[PDB]
């Protein structure tokens, strides 16, 4: 009898077994089997990672060593796939991308 | 007395953080906005896959369901690739 | 089904301009940036730069700065390559690649490369060349000067013929790829394993890193089947 969370035997960082608790407490289906969890988790970390990753890419190229909401917004309004899917939602404290019409400019 | 216990993801977000960035921080606002990406994220494939169970007349929510929800959801590369990483980390949990 | 279309061979007298096409077709044109590449006899490939057609954001190579200029035309779905002040030392195969925007992703998919005549981190592979015959393994490899956290890449590359795509991520099987092909490792050291050898695995094989700002490639290894 020992050790070895859920999370440690997929390889995950994120939490397997809330995953797995939130789905069978959150009305989603009378059943949840046991792969349904590991690959939420999974899809959620990769997620998490890579907009974390776009955002600290977005921090290093500003001479800072922090990330904040606008750091998100930039990894996030940059990217087709993220803009996409994150389309709906509103950052709070994230701004806007630096954006000015060509017809505006002076000339 | 009474009790104050609320649960997040912080945590794990700022594993992964280290894990991608060892040497850059996060400020609580920045958590707080992954906190909530994590949350809607997770209640929009958890409602995808419950509505692809529903359809089916099943009564249980698979990795199937999950993966057809994964790719339902989320634009083309990134569904790609989220499909790779579930695959991967349930092949690597049903080995030991 | 997805093409990277690009025009004939040019030769060009030294000091003007060269504006090359990478008319692309069969995918979303806007979700997937253009990389530029150069390949010569002298020094193998290298990375030019790229560009992102979604917000027409570019980003060049610090030894092609000036030089090489990147531009987008989003309604004829074209990416276009400008050379300025032809050299000598400019004559050389440009090929244009895509790659989405993913960190994950890789250099799929290649253009035919134009020829063109005129009138960081330090990739190594250890085998420069070997023989082998038919049936046996064969494994490369591509010690980097830093970490890359498997972000490395394995191309294939017949003679006269754009780079294949066989490894992206340091394990992951490309679109077609048989499971012959094997990669392993991550952080400084990588390799690439061929299960048993064919008529048509003669090529020179090239491992690629996008783990930071300048893409580099390997030196080339060509390998020769019996």
């Known amino acids: 009898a020992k050790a070895k969370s859920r999370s440690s035997r997929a390889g995950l960082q994120f939490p397997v077994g809330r995953v797995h608790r939130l789905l069978r407490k959150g009305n989603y289906a009378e059943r949840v089997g046991a792969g349904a969890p590991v690959y939420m988790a999974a899809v959620l970390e990769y997620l998490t990672a890579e907009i974390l990753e776009l955002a600290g890419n977005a921090a290093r190229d500003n001479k800072k060593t922090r990330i904040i909401p606008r750091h998100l917004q930039l990894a996030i309004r940059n990217d087709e796939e993220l803009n996409k899917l994150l389309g709906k939602v509103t950052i709070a404290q994230g701004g806007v991308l630096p954006n000015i019409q060509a017809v505006l400019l002076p000339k | 007395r009474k009790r104050s216990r609320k649960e997040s993801y912080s945590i794990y977000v700022y594993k992964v953080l280290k894990q991608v960035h060892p040497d850059t921080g996060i400020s609580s606002k920045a958590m707080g906005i992954m906190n909530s990406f994590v949350n809607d994220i997770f209640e929009r494939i958890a409602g995808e896959a419950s509505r692809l169970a529903h359809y089916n007349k099943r009564s249980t929510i698979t990795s199937r369901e999950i993966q057809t929800a994964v790719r339902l959801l989320l634009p083309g590369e990134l569904a790609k690739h989220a499909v790779s990483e579930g695959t991967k980390a349930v092949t690597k949990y049903t080995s030991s | 089904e997805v093409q990277l279309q690009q025009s004939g061979p040019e030769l060009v007298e030294p000091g003007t301009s060269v504006k090359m096409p990478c008319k692309a077709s069969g995918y979303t044109f806007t979700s997937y940036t253009i990389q530029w590449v150069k390949q010569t006899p002298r020094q193998g490939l290298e990375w030019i730069g790229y560009?992102?057609?979604?917000?027409?954001?570019?980003k060049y190579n610090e030894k092609f700065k000036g030089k090489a200029t990147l531009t987008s035309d989003k309604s004829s779905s074209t990416v276009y390559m400008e050379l300025s002040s032809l050299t000598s030392e400019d004559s050389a195969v440009y090929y244009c690649?895509?790659?989405?925007?993913?960190?994950?992703?890789?250099?799929?998919?290649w253009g035919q490369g134009t020829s063109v005549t005129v009138s960081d981190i330090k990739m190594t592979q250890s085998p420069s060349s070997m023989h082998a015959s038919l049936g046996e393994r064969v494994t490369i490899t591509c010690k980097a000067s830093?970490?890359?956290?498997?972000?490395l890449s394995w191309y294939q590359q017949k003679p006269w013929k754009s780079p294949k795509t066989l490894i992206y991520y340091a394990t992951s099987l490309a679109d077609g790829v048989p499971s012959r092909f094997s990669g392993s490792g991550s952080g400084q050291d990588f390799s690439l394993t061929i299960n048993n050898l064919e008529s048509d695995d003669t090529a020179t094989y090239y491992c690629?890193?996008?783990?930071?700002?300048?893409?580099?490639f390997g030196s080339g290894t060509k390998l020769e089947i019996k």
């Open positions: 690649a895509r790659k989405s925007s993913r960190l994950r992703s890789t250099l799929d998919y």
């Open positions: 830093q970490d890359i956290r498997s972000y």
């Open positions: 560009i992102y057609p979604y917000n027409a954001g570019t």
């Open positions: 690629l890193q996008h783990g930071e700002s300048p893409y580099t």
